[PDB]
Design a binder for this molecule. Structure first.
Ligand SMILES: [Mg+2]
Lengths: 83, 100, 230, 147, 50, 230
RNA sequence: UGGCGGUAGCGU
């Protein structure tokens, strides 16, 4: 359900970091076991990542901010567990 | 047969060796999908000769391009023939005419 | 507006194959529509019977030649493909043909069980050039629809394939030419009613009225899904 | 259960393998290119669809992009696997993104041959054609009258 | 000579007839050119190329 | 299996609007989609009963190339707007309606004198606009029950109206359908991927439900083909 | 389930 990504590159810019962020998001869905926020109407990871880019929910900034938050919360949970 | 031709398809077929051109005129004695027997006329036997010409056709023989090379008789039993007439057409030939 | 109902008025059987049928009365719009639909259905989905598998007495493979016949086995299969046959009752028929002596071996020489009927006895099958040579063959006739290539029949490999059982492509369609020409009809005093004339050229294995009825039944069955909808 | 069983199922050609294949190809672009790739547009990706036959069906408009007439030319097809390659296929390999030529900026896709001919026959006007002087309310009624 | 031969065969001398579409049953607006042409089969099969 | 034929089992209906519908039907036998779509399109377009405006008389107007004060719309525009009007009639085939209005503003379909048998699908449909309060408008519209599309040039003299003063003839769009198109896509069943899937996009004038019109056309064709069933 | 050169031909 995606044939033109012009509205996606206009959202991200430079047409290059969009590929990297979409690849990271698709890897998060596929091997990372993440939950696709947008509805999944029988599609695989890459187009869910592209549509999430389109809707503006995910970009580079939100992605690494969420990654840092997950890292710090899991570190806190681990240190609580060992203590 | 090609509906529109230039007229030399007969010459091309005859000069090429795909066809089975009779060497001596006569009357067909035994026609078959494999062999043709020609009983030559009274003028054309050498002394002390049977006067029987045996033409052996080539059926489904491989070519240099992995294509079929088949020979099919065109004459009928009892049909008189003369020297130079076609007896069995080869590939892409119909009644002694090139048919690509 | 109380649409009138077309009826099959008369059938003109000029020859054993060529036929002309007339349908009337018909309204202005319905004529071309019915003509086109009937033409397509008759040309495509008309059932028939055809020869598929053959077995020669002493032929190992269809790329060979048999002594005494002036035609190759491939030519024999091609001639068998054009055979016209009607079964009237079962799906599988086995026919045996045995001939001896010099002469044109035709479809009339094929032994008939009586239920099976040959439409064209004049159809020549082969030619025996030598008197001592004899030809014995067994052919299989099956009822089907449309065109079935030999490769599709080969796909059934449950019983493997005995050597010498040659396979021939099946042309189950009994019709070869279909045309229609609607024209003006004189019924009552209305000048708008039209008569549809359908000219068909078949192989003689099917009746015109039966073919028309089958096509109409198929169209009605297809439109039954349209009628109900959701 | 194992890779050998999957291999056997594939060589047996069930219907489940066809359904699995249909699911796989759903949005997996494949790259098509010509042997004499001269300019940048020589290779482009497409979203393939299962068809019968033994030949690759190609879009008519993009043919002028490939400079490949349907007279026996052969296309070569490659299949990306990794996610980065698939996103490259969807983002830059795509033919939709390639609309302007990189040499002069003119559009690369351009209607040609029968297409434009049809449009010509749809725009030429006669004088005594049937229906002259009629007044219609919209294109829908025009289509109704024509059909 | 071609026109005379067509006249002998009772076919139209213009060489173009009125074809009817089989897909929709309509009639083509303009006459089209039909006739018997000799066509060959090149040794460029598809099964041995894929 | 000769009598057996494939039937669409996945009827899908999408309602883009109250009058626009898209019907997807699959699987269908090869070649059946094209003929079914062509027959349905022809029957829907040319052979559907319906009520539509035939002629209208306007006081002070004698010809098409005339003009009236207080209305910015030309007489041709008035005729086209009357053509766009859709009326549902059940009491009888032919009905005379009277529309009289004076003032400033849009004169829409809600201003027509309403009878019990007649019904207006779209009251908001604007017939004309009155730009002068002193000017008044008064038409006597004639609505008749007919079939298909009847151009005004057909009845320009065959009607033999003998030229009553102000009787302008208008085109009669009896068929409720406004635009119908049918496409055939490829569809796969098991290993066979040559099946036909029929997509029909059609719009109506709002008088009847699109699927109701499709059902009516299917019933009409089935009743036409009644004489050749079984 | 073994490919390395050479020769000729084919499509751009
Ligand atoms: Mg080329």
């Amino acid at each position: 359900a995606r044939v033109t990504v012009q509205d996606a590159v206009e959202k991200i810019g430079n047409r290059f970091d969009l590929v990297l962020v979409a690849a990271r998001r698709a890897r998060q869905m596929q091997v990372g076991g993440k939950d696709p926020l947008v509805p999944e109407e029988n599609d695989k990871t890459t187009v869910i990542a592209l549509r999430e880019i389109e809707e503006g929910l995910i970009n580079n900034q939100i992605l690494d901010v969420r990654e840092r938050q997950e890292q710090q919360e899991q570190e806190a949970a681990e240190l609580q567990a060992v203590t | 047969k090609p509906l529109v031709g230039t007229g030399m398809e007969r010459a091309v077929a005859v000069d090429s060796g795909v066809t089975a051109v009779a060497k001596r005129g006569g009357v067909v004695q035994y026609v078959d999908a494999s062999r043709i027997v020609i009983k030559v006329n009274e003028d054309e036997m050498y002394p002390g000769e049977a006067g029987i010409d045996i033409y052996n056709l080539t059926k489904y023989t491989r070519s240099n391009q992995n294509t079929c090379i088949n020979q099919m008789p065109c004459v009928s039993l009892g049909e008189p023939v003369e020297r130079g007439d076609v007896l069995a057409d080869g590939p892409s030939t119909d009644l002694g005419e090139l048919a690509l | 507006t109380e649409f009138l109902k077309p009826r099959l008025v008369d059938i003109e059987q000029v020859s054993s194959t060529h036929a002309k049928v007339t349908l009337e009365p018909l309204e202005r719009g319905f004529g071309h529509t019915l003509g086109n639909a009937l033409r397509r259905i008759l040309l495509s989905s008309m059932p028939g019977c055809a020869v598929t598998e053959v077995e020669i007495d002493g032929v190992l493979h269809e790329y060979s030649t048999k002594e005494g016949v002036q035609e190759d086995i491939l030519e024999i299969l091609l001639n068998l493909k054009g055979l016209a046959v009607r079964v009237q009752g079962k799906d599988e028929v086995i026919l045996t043909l045995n001939k001896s002596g010099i002469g044109p071996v035709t479809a009339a020489d094929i032994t008939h069980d009586g239920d099976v009927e040959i439409v064209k006895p004049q159809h020549v099958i082969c030619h025996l050039t030598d008197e001592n040579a004899s030809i014995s063959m067994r052919i299989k006739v099956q009822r089907g629809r449309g065109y079935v290539p030999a490769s599709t029949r080969i796909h059934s490999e449950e019983d493997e394939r005995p050597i010498g059982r040659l396979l021939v492509d099946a042309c189950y369609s009994p019709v070869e030419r279909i045309a229609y020409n609607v024209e003006a009809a004189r019924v009552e005093q209305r000048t708008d009613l039209d008569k549809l004339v359908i000219e068909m050229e078949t192989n003689g294995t099917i009746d015109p009225e039966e073919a028309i009825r089958r096509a109409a039944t198929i169209l009605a069955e297809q439109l039954e899904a349209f009628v109900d909808l959701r | 259960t194992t890779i050998k069983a999957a291999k056997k199922m594939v060589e047996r050609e069930e219907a489940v393998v066809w359904d699995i294949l249909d699911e796989v190809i759903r949005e997996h672009p494949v790259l098509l290119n010509r042997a004499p790739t001269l300019h940048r547009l020589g290779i482009q990706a497409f979203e393939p669809v299962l068809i019968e036959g033994k030949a690759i069906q190609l879009h008519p408009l993009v043919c002028a992009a490939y400079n490949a007439d349907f007279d026996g030319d052969q296309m070569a097809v490659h299949v990306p696997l990794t996610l980065e390659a698939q996103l490259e296929a969807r983002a830059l390999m795509m033919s939709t993104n390639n609309i302007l030529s990189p040499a002069n900026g003119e559009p690369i896709i351009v209607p040609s041959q029968d297409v434009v001919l049809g449009l010509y026959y749809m725009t030429r006007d006669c004088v005594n054609a049937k229906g002259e002087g009629m007044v219609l309310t919209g294109p829908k009624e025009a289509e109704r009258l024509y059909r | 000579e071609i026109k005379e031969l067509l006249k002998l065969g009772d076919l139209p001398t213009s060489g173009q007839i009125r074809l009817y579409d089989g897909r929709t049953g309509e009639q083509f607006e303009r006459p089209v050119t039909v006739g018997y042409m000799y066509m060959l089969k090149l040794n460029h099969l598809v099964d041995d190329k894929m």
